[PDB]
Design a protein around this ligand. Structure first.
Ligand SMILES: CCC1=C(C)/C(=C/C2=NC(=C\c3[nH]c(/C=C4\NC(=O)[C@H](C)[C@H]4CC)c(C)c3CCC(=O)O)/C(CCC(=O)O)=C2C)NC1=O
Ligand SMILES: CCC1=C(C)/C(=C/C2=NC(=C\c3[nH]c(/C=C4\NC(=O)[C@H](C)[C@H]4CC)c(C)c3CCC(=O)O)/C(CCC(=O)O)=C2C)NC1=O
Ligand SMILES: CCC1=C(C)/C(=C/C2=NC(=C\c3[nH]c(/C=C4\NC(=O)[C@H](C)[C@H]4CC)c(C)c3CCC(=O)O)/C(CCC(=O)O)=C2C)NC1=O
Ligand SMILES: CCC1=C(C)/C(=C/C2=NC(=C\c3[nH]c(/C=C4\NC(=O)[C@H](C)[C@H]4CC)c(C)c3CCC(=O)O)/C(CCC(=O)O)=C2C)NC1=O
Ligand SMILES: CCC1=C(C)/C(=C/C2=NC(=C\c3[nH]c(/C=C4\NC(=O)[C@H](C)[C@H]4CC)c(C)c3CCC(=O)O)/C(CCC(=O)O)=C2C)NC1=O
Ligand SMILES: CCC1=C(C)/C(=C/C2=NC(=C\c3[nH]c(/C=C4\NC(=O)[C@H](C)[C@H]4CC)c(C)c3CCC(=O)O)/C(CCC(=O)O)=C2C)NC1=O
Ligand SMILES: CCC1=C(C)/C(=C/C2=NC(=C\c3[nH]c(/C=C4\NC(=O)[C@H](C)[C@H]4CC)c(C)c3CCC(=O)O)/C(CCC(=O)O)=C2C)NC1=O
Ligand SMILES: CCC1=C(C)/C(=C/C2=NC(=C\c3[nH]c(/C=C4\NC(=O)[C@H](C)[C@H]4CC)c(C)c3CCC(=O)O)/C(CCC(=O)O)=C2C)NC1=O
Ligand SMILES: CCC1=C(C)/C(=C/C2=NC(=C\c3[nH]c(/C=C4\NC(=O)[C@H](C)[C@H]4CC)c(C)c3CCC(=O)O)/C(CCC(=O)O)=C2C)NC1=O
Lengths: 147, 161, 160, 66, 160, 160, 161, 161, 160, 160, 161
């Protein structure tokens, strides 16, 4: 449980980090920084939604706030997951328990462990709703320790 | 998830045809009943907790299921039961507003039987609880609004059984 | 529609429908008669709308019908008028439903990807819906033309 | 929206990594008001002192409109 | 109001306002006179409404005015009527807003937590707003009573 | 219990039981005799505990038995004493188990939601457990009263 | 985020009074403007892409910015420029609908100044482009709503400069 | 985060020596206080909600803050106020158990000042509420542990002011 | 260049440069003369390449030079050839860089968005760079034509 | 100490301290005298422990005192005994803390990295703390030797 | 992130011209340095751990920092110190390979100053350690590449101070 944060090498999926922090005022034309930031935004779009979303549907306001550097990658993934296209795709078409399970597999990278964990997240879905479900998944200590 | 309008449009689109007179008549029927649907939805949103607690007071209270050994015994199980009944009333209100029970089998009745069978939840006792909830809300909103609520309550009880 | 959108927007928020949303549904329920009249106006005269709009489009943008364009030839021009017929049908659906979720949820999501895979200029399609809007709002009364032009406006806006 | 602009810094404490990680240990970002308590408790659980908190948008003393 | 809610909806969906909700804002604009009349009649007879509703609440639920209860004594009953004054004031604000959101911002977020702190039974407050609803809809004409009863109904729904 | 809690806390950590946890289990195993004596003290005199605690509660909080309160009438007062009997039984379970996971895991998780759905003031229930604690710690020796008052203290703390 | 209605309610709320007749006067002023606000908003929503392309064709196209050496040279910077202009027009439409420039001070002009200093964006070219867009939308939607868009575009320019 | 024990170990560690007899003296001082620290902590944990409600009923209730015009007017601000008070009491209990106010300087008073300046929270009303809570918990749990809670509540007030 | 890309790869993986990519930088260093020769021949005959490729594009796709199309008129055709000049310039930059990254930074990020704004059909631009590729590889020797055609191929791949 | 660790456990699990770990803190409080006696005897005889353990280590592993080894010379052997002094000091700190966490914070995080830098064989340091453990448990009474040997055992476990 | 090549392309791009002969002169200068840059980079990559241990043994070891009372006392701080030194050497090798100190200004010296002020790290000891590492790598890999590493280590020190 100390090694939740250790990334797998060549035996699992690759992990994308936003470590370069896209920093520039008076940026070079052939700056390599924006291109890697586009790679990371690409990666967040296809890990949250699964696929690259259609061209009219992607959020440009959260991409712009990330490339300017005011929000973190965690809050950017929270703004991707609390969007209308994500909830119309995954939360509004499905059963509530199946939506809890699939949103947990999308945002935490793993299926749920047991019943307490599902009785606690679907209670957050009960008294508060889907937005607090995304907020409680992104809050969790496994998310902060893993990513 | 589709209301009466979206289902009419989906039928006319799967046909590939334009909206003929029968579709116009169906949409006129929905546009006449919609104000009654709105007022019944407001009246049900008024008294959510009262309808739920009167349904438990009619059916589930003072029976064996609230006694030791019952599935409604503990405070956790009581809170989850109130939570389940609030879900049934809320989604019956949604299906009343849409005029189509597609949300019920999309989002309530999808894995509900297998969940209740895995947990050990009695399906007959919760069907009686939903029936008492239907009886209370039909006493609340009147005859015809109670009937158009009870058709979706009977849909939930039929999909649960 | 309006009822779907209100139900979903109250549904994520874990609450019932607010009374303001309820009188929204009530006002849409009362205005459904005028919506059905606009729908019959758009449905009954679809031949003249598609014909005159195709004529004004090919007058306005002649390069797509010239050799080298997409809609060059008999069957290609027939498919072009068929695509315009599809968009007028979605306009009628959005007029009845009171919202643009039929139009967007059927024929506007991957429209850029589809018309890029076909090799089609999307600005000329926006001009086609513009000429359809001109013929259609030339066919009605004032408030009826405004209410139909809202959905025509949404289609041309969702093109570009 | 009442967006807070925070200039906080997060400590090391343990598990020395050979990544660069300047962007985690010192940063300036902006978070919404409603989850500002949760995020502040994350910085408190990490153990790093926060330097400056400002309110990027919105006004104090507003009962309606947020 | 309805305009702030439509704006935050178009913002989160990152698009312009649809002509459906433009027509909603326009219909709200035209119905401003009716809501002004409703809020006018409510601001007129607030004392009579509060007195009849408080006596009806004390007749229905005597636990709050009993010894050992919450609202026991002159000042406690006066503060009970003051809280009913605040809730009728927020009812008028939401009636003139066309939306339930100022009632939410000012007096619906933490009422369970703060009344858990003071010791006030919240279902008694729901009964008080129920009596205020019955009296105010008894005063109004039936269509305007339906409009005000929508907001009153929302308040008692968010209570219990 | 203590053994369950130690096993689970070593179980998540992927380790065996540490020796400090093992002498914790050993000390609980030795103190089980005094725990069983406190349990027989609480079990054998449950009639007088429930009777005197109900008497002192209705003396202290008379509004819940006055017309308008929850526990008004014969069967409602009988159900009130039954709920107090339930909580004394859970107190006995927590006394034997050496930890509050019987009490919390049976009758304290959704206690707020249940008593809000019934219409019950939870502060008056906290006063009921307070009077039960007064009668029970008036019934034992000093260290026995402290060890039972720890679990009574947990129940009143988990109420508010 | 406040309307004319929410600002009236807010001002009557800070001092603590109920609704007075002058508040009703401001509210009826807002409504009688708001009908034409709706029609102008629909017209702007219909023609936003043509408005932005006419704005850049008026002011920014044959200058040094869209040329080499300017901040609008590459296609990355051109796409960012068109996106910035679209966002100015959209938020001006929101401020026109609400009747209050609090959204422009809340979401647009919050940190736009310092990132425009830090990226080296010229403020003067942006202000010229916004003013060109202002009289483009004024010639499109009409005179009074042209003034409505004018004070909100001027609010954006004053927060920018 | 340091106890009395961890601060003793830390101080003996910076200068580099082993445990001397004076360190053992401080450790036995901590233990003989720590038994009654445990009993006072259990008493405070039992009665925290009544302590906070008596604190706000003592000082904040019939003033301008809980009235209109104050920062405690709305139910949002009231719930935030009760949560702030609960957090002050909980962290004071942690500092009482550890025997060191380093937790209050670490987690409470870290950035609490500047957000209290930025939101416009009155410092004086909060200090009065904390002192009212201080003698409420002093009358509850006793005299010596009342002094224990007193210096930690005073530490919170001195970091606040 | 290849060195910036190897450096950002070793940076994100937080290690030094592997001897494989040190050998890659060394091989790039030795192949500098061949890429200088390729970029030399391309900068020599840029006008002939542009003229033959533009006439081949206008012969293949006449929709852009038709009335109503994008590149209609003297100045519009001249701006079309100017855009082909910019793309051949970026081709030479990427040829001398050993990597496609300056072509990405200068002219590949938002070409779909900006050509959606201008109204330019992007597939016509892909055909233009296809004709420039065919002509430039017709000019070069076959191995150097393969190298330049790799970058040309990358540009038309990022286009369509 | 045990109190900081129980506090961070109750913090991450976002609950109050369980009565099991309250009893754990109370038992730690009562066992303070025994741990004071253990740390007292260790701080008494630190020089004799270090001298016998260093000579036993040099008798067991002569590679460190050989020419070419790490601890060669007067000052290097003195610094070796200084490092053994630091580790016995941290052993006493963890013995009086009731937890291994100050030993972790001060001298267990990067000992492999820093001894990779200095060239010290870390297994030789593990042998040194093994000899210090054997000598200190030879000095103590068997129960207190078991307690101190738990912390010594933890240090040699975190070494190798 | 720019090389000598990318900075040449960038400078020829801002003014808008093609490649001139002086740009080719800078490019051939970069290549004729770049061959020995590769061999020096392989030598530094081979011996990085010995370079860092000789740097700390030269300057930081028998001072007050590696002693108690300094910021290098604990094993946590020692491991962080060795990691900081390894990162300085690695980024200096990257800047030597690219022929441009833009990476050092981009990734190293971005926020390193303020965290070094906030954690209380001594700037002077770090600068001495980097200069000791500079002549250690100069004696290792040779004279001209020693100067190459020298200006990039000096760039790191000037951004630090
Ligand atoms: C939104 C669609 C949806 C529904 C309906 C749903 C139900 C659901 N009800 C559950 C439990 C429950 N449901 C009941 C309800 C009842 N038992 C009785 O005796 C009564 C007859 C009946 C109430 C009227 C009880 C007592 C439990 C708790 C079982 C337990 O804790 O062992 C559980 C077990 C996990 C948990 O409590 O939080 C689920 C998933 N989940 C969903 O996603
Ligand atoms: C209801 C939503 C919907 C749309 C829009 C739709 C479009 C659609 N348009 C097509 C072709 C086409 N559509 C056009 C249309 C045009 N080209 C022009 O130059 C004009 C600007 C424009 C019409 C005015 C043309 C020319 C083709 C043939 C493309 C080809 O043959 O390669 C095809 C492929 C053949 C087919 O199966 O019909 C589809 C699927 N399908 C849908 O389900
Ligand atoms: C890629 C560029 C980059 C750098 C350089 C970087 C440095 C960096 N150095 C740090 C700490 C440190 N750096 C030092 C440095 C030193 N020891 C001394 O006393 C000397 C003056 C110097 C040794 C040469 C020390 C002692 C700490 C830890 C202080 C503490 O937080 O306890 C920290 C805080 C987290 C940690 O504990 O490591 C960061 C982020 N981060 C980056 O992303
Ligand atoms: C606009 C949103 C809003 C609300 C809801 C609000 C409630 C509120 N209720 C209060 C008191 C009170 N409210 C009640 C009310 C009740 N108890 C009963 O017995 C009745 C059943 C119930 C009346 C419906 C009582 C008895 C007090 C005094 C409590 C005390 O003094 O302990 C006070 C304390 C005095 C003050 O500062 O004015 C506030 C702030 N304030 C607000 O700004
Ligand atoms: C072991 C955990 C556990 C608890 C606590 C529990 C409580 C519980 N209390 C109930 C009723 C009740 N409990 C009370 C109790 C009180 N009202 C007051 O005024 C007093 C303050 C207080 C008792 C001293 C009353 C009045 C009712 C009847 C509510 C009603 O009839 O609406 C009911 C519904 C009827 C039934 O089936 O008994 C349940 C399930 N069940 C459980 O399994
Ligand atoms: C909702 C309110 C809001 C605004 C307005 C906003 C603007 C914004 N404009 C940006 C860039 C930009 N904005 C411009 C602007 C212009 N082109 C010019 O030269 C003219 C002076 C002007 C065209 C009218 C340019 C050129 C850039 C990109 C410069 C660069 O980073 O390469 C960026 C950096 C990220 C990006 O590349 O887009 C942000 C965040 N963000 C927001 O959240
Ligand atoms: C663990 C340490 C810790 C503390 C203490 C903490 C406090 C804290 N108090 C806040 C607000 C607040 N705190 C108060 C306080 C008061 N009411 C008054 O008027 C009195 C002066 C005082 C009641 C005793 C109020 C009114 C607000 C909300 C003001 C607003 O933003 O609307 C907020 C902004 C978010 C929120 O709304 O809760 C934080 C983060 N955060 C922490 O992490
Ligand atoms: C190096 C990266 C880069 C690119 C790609 C670029 C494109 C670019 N293309 C332009 C115009 C244009 N480009 C075209 C090109 C075309 N339309 C057609 O018919 C042809 C098929 C196609 C030619 C392949 C046309 C017609 C215009 C003028 C558009 C107008 O004036 O409305 C302009 C406006 C004039 C100016 O400021 O120079 C720019 C900036 N600029 C750059 O810096
Ligand atoms: C409390 C946590 C802590 C530890 C662990 C620590 C270790 C430490 N060991 C050192 C040296 C050393 N330590 C050794 C020890 C050894 N090599 C051998 O041959 C023996 C097998 C082994 C002894 C067990 C030697 C030989 C040196 C000198 C290394 C040199 O000068 O190159 C130094 C350098 C001198 C100084 O600044 O005091 C430090 C800081 N310091 C600390 O603060």
């Amino acid at each position: 449980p100390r090694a939740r944060a250790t990334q797998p090498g060549s035996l699992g999926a690759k992990v994308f980090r936003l470590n370069n922090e896209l920093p520039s005022g008076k940026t070079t034309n052939v700056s390599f920084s924006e291109s890697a930031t586009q790679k990371v935004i690409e990666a967040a779009y296809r890990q949250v939604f699964g696929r690259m979303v259609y061209a009219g549907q992607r959020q440009k306001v959260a991409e712009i706030k990330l490339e300017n550097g005011e929000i973190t990658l965690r809050e950017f993934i929270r703004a991707l997951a609390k969007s209308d296209v994500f909830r119309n795709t995954y939360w509004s078409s499905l059963y509530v328990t199946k939506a809890v399970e699939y949103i947990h597999r999308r945002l935490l990278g793993r299926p749920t462990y047991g019943r307490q964990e599902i009785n606690s997240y679907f209670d957050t879905c009960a008294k508060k709703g889907f937005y607090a479900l995304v907020d409680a998944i992104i809050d969790s200590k496994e998310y902060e320790e893993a990513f | 998830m589709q209301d009466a309008i979206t289902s009419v449009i989906n039928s006319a689109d799967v046909q590939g045809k334009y909206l003929d007179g029968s579709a116009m008549d169906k949409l006129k029927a929905y546009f006449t009943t919609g104000a009654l649907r709105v007022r019944a939805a407001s009246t049900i949103s008024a008294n959510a907790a009262a309808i739920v607690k009167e349904a438990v007071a009619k059916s589930l209270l003072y029976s064996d299921v609230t006694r030791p050994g019952g599935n409604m015994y503990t405070t956790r199980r009581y809170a989850a039961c109130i939570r389940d009944l609030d879900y049934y009333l809320r989604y019956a209100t949604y299906a009343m507003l849409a005029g189509d029970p597609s949300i019920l089998d999309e989002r309530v009745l999808n894995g509900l039987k297998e969940t209740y069978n895995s947990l050990g939840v009695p399906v007959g006792s919760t069907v009686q609880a939903i029936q008492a909830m239907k009886e209370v809300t039909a006493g609340l909103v009147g005859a015809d609004a109670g009937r158009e609520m009870g058709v979706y309550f009977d849909y939930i009880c039929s999909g649960l059984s | 529609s309006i009822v779907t959108k209100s139900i979903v927007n109250a549904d994520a928020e874990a609450r019932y429908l607010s009374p303001g949303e309820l009188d929204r549904i009530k006002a849409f329920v009362t205005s459904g008669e005028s919506r059905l009249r606009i729908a019959e106006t758009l449905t009954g005269s679809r031949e003249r709308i598609i014909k005159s709009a195709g004529d004004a489009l090919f007058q306005k943008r002649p390069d797509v019908v010239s050799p080298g364009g997409n809609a060059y030839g008999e069957e290609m021009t027939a498919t072009c008028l068929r695509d315009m017929d599809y968009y007028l049908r979605l306009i009628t659906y959005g007029v009845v439903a009171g919202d643009v979720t039929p139009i967007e949820e059927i024929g506007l999501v991957g429209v850029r990807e589809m018309y890029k895979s076909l090799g089609t200029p999307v600005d000329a399609v926006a001009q086609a819906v513009r000429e359809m809007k001109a013929v259609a709002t030339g066919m009605m009364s004032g408030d009826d033309a405004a209410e139909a032009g809202a959905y025509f406006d949404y289609v041309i806006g969702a093109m570009e | 929206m009442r967006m807070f602009k925070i200039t906080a810094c997060v400590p090391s404490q343990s598990r020395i990594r050979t990544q660069r990680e300047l962007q985690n240990t010192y940063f300036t970002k902006l978070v919404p008001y409603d989850n500002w308590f949760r995020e502040q408790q994350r910085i408190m659980k990490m153990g790093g002192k926060i330097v400056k908190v400002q309110l990027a948008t919105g006004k104090p003393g507003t009962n309606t409109g947020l």
